[PDB]
Design a protein around this nucleic acid. Structure first.
Ligand SMILES: [Zn+2]
Ligand SMILES: [Zn+2]
Lengths: 116, 302, 399, 179, 240, 209, 48
DNA sequence: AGAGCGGGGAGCCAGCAGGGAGCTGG
RNA sequence: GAGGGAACCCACU
DNA sequence: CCAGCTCCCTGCTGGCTCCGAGTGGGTTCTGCCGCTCT
């Protein structure tokens, strides 16, 4: 589970993690000023070595408007039943181990993306 | 295998280069380990460099001040079986990379306890492959755990040898790297035996290794063979490398020219590069040296 | 022909307009302003002095240079103590001779029919597109360059920087030498990987968050609004975190400009002069194309954050690295841009010499003639030398 | 070798233009300036670059690109040599008006049909009579100049035999055709 | 002299009729190319539907590229072999190839059957655009005609994409010559200056200018290299 | 682990036996081919426990021609080796009156230790040899040809046949791995026998520099 | 320099003129030494 | 007034700043 | 019966 | 005792030299403009 950058509400800087031993709990403290805050998550950091599998969250629906993309009729959209979908490979640096085809529905107002 | 040939390899040969573009070893195996594939794979795995980063799926850091009540709540049972800094390092190892390296988790754990001298304690269990790291007893402990986590990921060797980035196992179909034996009938028989190719040079460790042939295992690195085996050995290895470069095209050069070049580069006991740094540092006269290169520098020197 | 026509119709006029005016003081005050150019047709002046329309064959045979005189309107205002401004208008002052591309708009072969060309002993199938310098036909080979004002992210191999964003920022609508900024990222070989910025005329690396504070954004939230546009992306947060860690120690704007000015070409001994040097670098010299005037800091900060964002997109593998040999990343300096670069340099030299001469004649004298002030040999011989030799610059720096 | 090159026959290096009329059109065509936006609007919008200067963002990039191409194809506010690129995946629109860009004319294809009809050829059989010329062919929206960075988003048919197709047509979204 | 004056009687030419193949051979070459292109499409469908199993030592790109290149090289080899089997004894391309005077069977294959795959830096034609080799292809097109397989011969003539990809391929050879000249010359100069003074002395030893022994005998046997010949040892290989 | 380090100790001991046999020292045929079973039975199985102990592995050999010409082979317990260690071992070499020894270190010696070795070299010859370097016999490699250390009479006969000086011969460094294997000093000449593609056999000579 | 040391002269002009003498002699011997300006002909080209 | 004259990469070698035994010194 | 150099460009194999 | 303490090991990094052979042909340039003195 990823953790983002949390901000001090007074001076809008970055909250650094810290512990207080008396309560012995994790509190996020700003160090531009002297503000502290209780941490909702005990997660401080996760490193995700082999969790670059997810790519569908990087696709936008606007690629259905690309004239240079290949179109197919044999993969209907599950979300709306439109026959035509553009398909493409992943445009990332993690593509070096995958010929995975991602499909995007070409019908406007739907923009559904999937794989196989 | 992306081995270099032609003009750039000849340049790396006559200019005695400490950094070949693709350094390699030709590891030959002894006995049954040469014959069957699985023991040769054992040899490969014990030569292949494996850090923690290769076998790790995730490393996460937690604030878990009470291990009796784990904040992850998926590790609770065996932590309570075993049960300190409040900072937890939870390491999840990927299943397939855990299996194909033929590792078991206690080997990893004893590697950490050996490397850090039990300054930091390690709990482990699997059945999700999970280790847990805490630090036993102003440069805050989460930042120290950051630092040791990066040290575990990058500069920690589990198995294998550090300079060998990759190992390719293959069974040669040609007689150039087959095992040629003389049978009891008296013929020459070519035996197909599994050989390994590497992407780095650590030839001394590899030669010392279990079931590796200490006789025929060789490198393509000239400096490394010179440092490990001597000057007549690097004379023969340089002969072999030059012959390979020349005869890759099928072209033939008489042996005496190669022998004369190798004898010239190995006559004075060290590897004399075909450069100004090798030729201009002999006991030749100043006029030959100035005719070759760095004319004014040589003439001032004389 | 089109590039030369743009050079003459537009580029020399904008070079004259772009020239700052001559302020000279002893003290009497002298302002010199260059307003409107005029280009005649190619004419020859013999030793008798009568102007004649010069044909291209005459230039080829007699080893002349096919050039046209360039006249400019100059206004001189004199400010005296207790006396109003004096406005003198020198109309159509000769300042040099521009070589004319053959069969261009201002060539004498323009608009001529094939019969008219054959009466002039010119081939109608001759394309034009060249100059006649000392009777020699000289062609300006177009020169490739990387495209300006565009962020390109590469991977410096065998370097201590893993990824490097780059923008040869050049001010549009004006001729001005390009200033390159390098927002880059260190290699893993440091607890984190930090984003850094290499600035023009700054001898040392300065971190990017210090620069963002130096344009006047002290909150990390304000800076990250310019760098990261969607806060629901954690990985780009994880890579921007080491920069905030390395640049936390500077928290306000003035100490940030001090940190910038600490390693210029000449560090200012006065802290206030260091702050002024930092303002001059961060405004005039860092990303000139997004803005050059005062109070243009938000557009410049947005473009710098875009450059950092592109760098982080490449470092995530989320966007492909740019190709140097991709030819949409290249521009072709034709005769227009090349001659405009030359003419900017030589007009700067002409202004320098006129300013020196008039300072000399107001330091001991009281007035100067402006006709004697302008050395037309500067523009004329510089254009003639660069087109004749091909060594494209100044004569004394030809190596 | 490979360092000295030669132009192709119909290649034309762009001479340069001023960004000002395109900027005035963009300001009055629903583009929001960077000074007057909150940064939160940037994430789902399309950034607009004019000669490499980020001048604002737009919410409907396809309609803006269609309007821009329609303006260029009739020799309106945008002149014919201006390059207009939509990085659709990257959510950017780059407009280039500067010099040095090398472009070439291409036949515009709309709905698998050339906009070049027989009336254009019949008019171009009599240049010396009708005063119809190539510039009239550009002004009719039939051909347009595409440079290298714009060519990386167009879909070219080598011949009009490609526009007329069957079976696995390979492509039904041709935008341009080789002359 | 004798053979050149007999050649006035016999005569020797090359024409456009030596590059013509049979109609049956044209059909065979077209069938081989069609089948191989269909095989490449099948491998593309296998990789796209995630049914391509990576091989030891290779990534998925490397296995896909190796398998596609194996299919295309098998196509080029089979079409070439069909082209040479089509040749008559009166063919002049064959006449100069079997004499060894000029050309190879690869030239006959390229002229008659298939030019083949055009490679830049040992790989197929790279995606110089955004995932396209040329703007005449769709994005992420890994098929043969997109990535530089010229399915035409030199007599058939190349299509414009094939022409451009073949120009990309030939520019590689021009560059390799023009940049190998200087490095090879520097290597020759360094070798000469390293061994210029080494010579066989009158006691048959091989010594340099410092009179230091490099070899005790030249080539370890004391023989000159212009008179030694390839021979076979008759007692090495046979059994006991 | 005790088993693998016992394997290393056995292989080091076998390599030292082969080395001492190559130097002319009297090493019997039984201890040339000492198997791992025989090493385990004679010395032990658990070095960390201490049944094979490195100071118990110290070898003493004598030359074939000269019985009083003896060489020690020491195996220090500690991984590094410092000045007190060479001082202890050299006092031991004094009290058997032996001038030659090998020191098979694990990790290595500090620079002061090697400097002390060079200082005491005129009286007692002490050769450092890392365990990693001794885990194989490099003279059994296919690249290393047959080295034979020449006697002084043979060197003088050589230089009279080829009318040569010492500096006109090819050279080999004293720090060469084969030169370290044979324990040869400067001024000695090594006769290298190697096979030849053209001649069959070729004999080179190398002066130690 | 001979004129300057023949009469009375300051130490700093002597040191500067010694610097010029050293530069001229060194550029006669070698005209590509880094960190110092190239000795040039009055046309602008460097000397050989 | 006018004339001649003063005035790009790729690979080595060396040199510096940080290590870490360690004899001399309580 | 023989009085310039240098730089740069183009080309040839 | 144990803290003090010198002297050879490693490593970054700026200086520094090198980058095919042989041919034609061309052009432009060196050698430059203010003077101080009669
Ligand atoms: Zn705060
Ligand atoms: Zn849909």
């Amino acid at each position: 589970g990823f953790v983002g950058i949390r901000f001090c509400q007074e001076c809008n800087n970055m909250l650094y993690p810290k512990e207080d031993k008396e309560n012995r709990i994790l509190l996020y403290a700003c160090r531009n000023c002297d503000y502290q805050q209780e941490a909702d998550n005990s997660c401080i950091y996760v490193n995700k070595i082999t969790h670059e599998v997810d790519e569908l969250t990087q696709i936008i629906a606007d690629v259905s408007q690309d004239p240079t993309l290949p179109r197919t009729e044999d993969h209907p959209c599950q979300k709306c039943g439109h026959k035509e979908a553009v398909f493409f490979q992943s445009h990332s640096a993690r593509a070096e181990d995958a010929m995975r085809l991602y499909y995007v529905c070409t019908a406007p107002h739907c923009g559904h993306r999937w794989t196989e | 295998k992306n081995v270099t040939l032609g003009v750039p390899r000849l340049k790396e040969l006559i200019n005695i280069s400490k950094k070949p573009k693709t350094p390699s070893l030709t590891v030959f195996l002894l006995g049954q380990s040469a014959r069957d594939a699985e023991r040769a794979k054992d040899i490969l795995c014990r030569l292949e460099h494996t850090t923690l980063r290769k076998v790790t799926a995730n490393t996460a850091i937690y604030y878990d001040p009470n291990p009796q009540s784990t904040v992850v709540a998926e590790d609770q049972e065996w932590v309570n079986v075993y049960y300190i800094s409040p900072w937890l390092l939870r390491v999840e190892l990927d299943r397939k990379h855990m299996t194909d390296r033929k590792l078991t988790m206690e080997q990893i754990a004893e590697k950490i306890n050996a490397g850090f001298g039990d300054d930091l304690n390690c709990i482990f269990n699997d059945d999700k492959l999970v280790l847990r790291i805490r630090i036993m007893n102003k440069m805050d402990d989460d930042v120290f755990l950051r630092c040791i986590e990066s040290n575990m990921l990058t500069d920690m060797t589990l198995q294998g040898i550090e300079q060998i980035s990759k190992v390719y196992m293959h069974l040669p179909q040609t007689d150039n790297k087959k095992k040629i034996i003389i049978t009891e009938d008296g013929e020459f028989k070519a035996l197909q035996e599994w050989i390994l190719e590497t992407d780095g040079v650590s030839l001394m460790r590899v030669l010392s290794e279990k079931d590796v042939d200490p006789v025929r295992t060789t490198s393509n690195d000239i400096v490394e063979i010179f440092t490990v085996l001597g000057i007549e050995a690097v004379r023969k290895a340089l002969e072999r490398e030059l012959y390979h470069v020349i005869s890759f095209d099928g072209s033939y050069v008489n042996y005496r020219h190669l022998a004369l070049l190798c004898d010239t580069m190995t006559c004075r006991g060290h590897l004399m590069a075909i450069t100004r740094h090798g030729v201009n540092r002999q006991d030749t006269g100043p006029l030959m040296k100035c005719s070759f290169e760095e004319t004014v520098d040589v003439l001032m020197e004389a | 022909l089109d590039s030369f026509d743009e050079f003459i119709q537009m580029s020399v006029q904008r070079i004259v307009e772009d020239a700052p005016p001559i302020d000279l003081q002893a003290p009497p005050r002298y302002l010199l302003k260059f307003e409107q150019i005029y280009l005649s047709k190619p004419t020859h002046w013999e030793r008798d002095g009568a102007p004649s329309p010069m044909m291209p064959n005459e230039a080829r045979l007699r080893n002349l240079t096919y050039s046209a005189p360039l006249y400019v309107d100059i206004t001189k205002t004199v400010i005296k103590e207790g006396e109003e401004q004096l406005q003198t208008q020198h109309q159509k002052t000769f300042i040099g001779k521009i070589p004319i591309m053959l069969r261009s708009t201002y060539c004498l072969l323009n608009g001529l029919t094939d019969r008219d060309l054959c009466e002039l002993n010119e081939c109608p199938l001759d394309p034009g597109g060249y100059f006649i310098i000392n009777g020699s036909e000289k062609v300006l080979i177009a020169q490739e360059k990387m495209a300006t004002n565009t962020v390109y992210v590469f991977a410096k191999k065998d370097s201590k920087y893993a990824y490097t964003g780059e923008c040869r920022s050049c001010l549009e609508n004006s001729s001005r030498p390009t200033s390159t900024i390098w927002v880059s990222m260190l290699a893993r070989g440091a607890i984190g990987q930090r984003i850094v910025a290499t600035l023009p005329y700054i001898k040392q690396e300065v971190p990017i968050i210090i620069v963002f504070r130096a344009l006047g954004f002290v909150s990390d939230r304000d800076i990250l609004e310019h760098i990261i546009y969607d806060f629901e992306d954690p990985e780009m947060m994880e890579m921007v975190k080491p920069s905030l860690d390395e640049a936390f120690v500077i928290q306000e704007q003035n100490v940030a400009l001090n940190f910038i000015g600490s390693r210029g070409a000449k560090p200012g001994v006065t802290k206030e002069k260091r702050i002024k040097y930092a303002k001059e670098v961060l405004q005039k010299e860092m990303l000139p194309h997004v803005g050059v005037s005062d109070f243009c800091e938000t557009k410049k900060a947005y473009f710098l954050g875009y450059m950092v964002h592109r760098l982080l997109l490449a470092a995530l593998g989320r966007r492909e690295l740019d190709d140097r040999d991709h030819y949409g990343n290249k521009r072709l300096d034709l005769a227009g841009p090349l001659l405009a670069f030359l003419f900017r340099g030589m007009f700067k030299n002409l202004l320098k010499e006129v300013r020196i001469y008039a300072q000399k004649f107001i330091d001991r004298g009281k007035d100067f003639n402006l006709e004697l002030a302008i050395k037309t040999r500067i523009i004329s011989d510089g254009l003639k030398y660069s087109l004749a030799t091909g060594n494209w610059g100044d004569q004394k720096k030809a190596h | 070798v490979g360092l000295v090159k030669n132009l192709a026959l119909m290649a034309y290096i762009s001479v340069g233009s001023q960004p000002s009329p395109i900027l005035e059109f963009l300001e009055e065509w629903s583009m929001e300036n960077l000074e007057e936006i909150s940064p939160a609007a940037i994430a789902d919008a399309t950034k607009i670059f004019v000669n490499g200067c980020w001048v604002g963002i737009h919410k409907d990039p396809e309609q803006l690109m269609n309007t821009l191409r329609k303006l260029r194809r009739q020799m309106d506010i945008i002149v014919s040599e201006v390059s207009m690129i939509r990085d659709i995946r990257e959510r950017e629109i780059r407009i280039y008006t500067d010099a040095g860009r090398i472009c070439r004319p291409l036949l515009i294809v709309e709905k698998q049909k050339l906009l070049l009809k027989k009336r254009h050829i019949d008019q171009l059989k009599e240049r010396e009579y009708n005063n119809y010329s190539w510039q009239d062919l550009v002004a009719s929206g039939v051909v347009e100049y595409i440079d290298t960075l714009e060519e990386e988003t167009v879909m070219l048919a080598m011949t009009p035999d490609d526009l007329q197709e069957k079976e696995v047509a390979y492509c039904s979204t041709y935008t341009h055709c080789e002359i | 002299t004798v053979i050149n004056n007999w050649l006035l009687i016999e005569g020797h030419t090359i024409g456009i009729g030596d590059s013509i193949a049979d109609s049956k051979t044209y059909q065979d070459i077209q069938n081989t190319i069609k089948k191989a292109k269909q095989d490449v499409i099948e491998v593309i469908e296998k990789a796209h539907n995630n049914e391509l199993e990576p091989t030891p030592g290779n990534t998925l790109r490397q296995t896909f590229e190796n398998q596609v290149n194996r299919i295309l090289n098998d196509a080029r080899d089979k079409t070439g072999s069909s082209a040479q089997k089509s040749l008559s004894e009166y063919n002049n391309f064959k006449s100069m190839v079997v004499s060894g005077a000029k050309g190879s069977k690869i030239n006959i294959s390229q002229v008659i059957a298939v030019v083949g795959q055009q490679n830049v830096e040992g790989k197929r034609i790279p995606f110089g655009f955004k995932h396209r080799t040329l703007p005449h292809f769709i994005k992420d097109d890994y098929g043969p005609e997109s990535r530089g397989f010229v399915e035409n011969s030199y007599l058939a003539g190349l299509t414009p994409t094939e022409f451009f990809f073949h120009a990309m391929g030939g520019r590689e050879g021009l560059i390799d010559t023009a940049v190998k000249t200087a490095e090879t010359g520097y290597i020759q100069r360094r070798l000469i200056k390293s061994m210029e003074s080494v010579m066989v002395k009158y006691d048959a030893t091989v010594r340099n200018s410092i009179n230091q022994v490099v070899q005790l005998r030249y080539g370890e046997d004391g023989l000159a290299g212009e008179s030694v010949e390839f021979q076979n040892l008759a007692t090495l290989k046979p059994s006991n | 682990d005790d088993e693998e380090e016992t394997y290393r100790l056995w292989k080091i001991r076998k390599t030292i036996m082969q080395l001492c046999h190559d130097r002319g020292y009297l090493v019997t045929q039984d201890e040339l081919d000492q198997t791992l079973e025989e090493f385990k039975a004679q010395f032990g199985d658990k070095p960390s426990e201490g049944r094979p102990r490195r100071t118990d592995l110290t070898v003493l050999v004598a030359h074939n021609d000269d019985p009083t010409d003896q060489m020690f082979v020491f195996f220090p317990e500690e991984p590094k080796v410092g000045i007190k260690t060479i001082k202890v071992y050299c006092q031991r070499m004094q009290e058997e009156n032996i001038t030659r020894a090998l020191i098979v270190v694990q990790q290595g010696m500090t620079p002061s230790a090697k400097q002390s070795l060079v200082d005491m070299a005129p009286k007692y010859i002490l050769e450092q040899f890392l365990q990693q370097e001794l885990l194989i016999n490099i003279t059994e490699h296919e690249l290393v040809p047959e080295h034979v250390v020449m006697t002084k009479e043979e060197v003088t006969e050589l230089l009279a046949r080829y009318k040569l000086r010492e500096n006109q011969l090819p050279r080999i460094q004293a720090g060469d791995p084969v030169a370290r294997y044979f324990g040869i000093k400067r001024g000695q000449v090594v006769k290298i026998i190697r096979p030849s593609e053209t001649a069959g056999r070729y004999i080179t000579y190398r002066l130690v520099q | 320099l001979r004129r300057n040391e023949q009469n009375g002269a300051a130490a700093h002009v002597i040191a500067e003129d010694v610097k010029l003498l050293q530069f001229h002699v060194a550029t006669m011997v070698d005209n590509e030494l880094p960190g110092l300006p190239r000795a040039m002909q009055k046309s602008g080209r460097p000397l050989k």
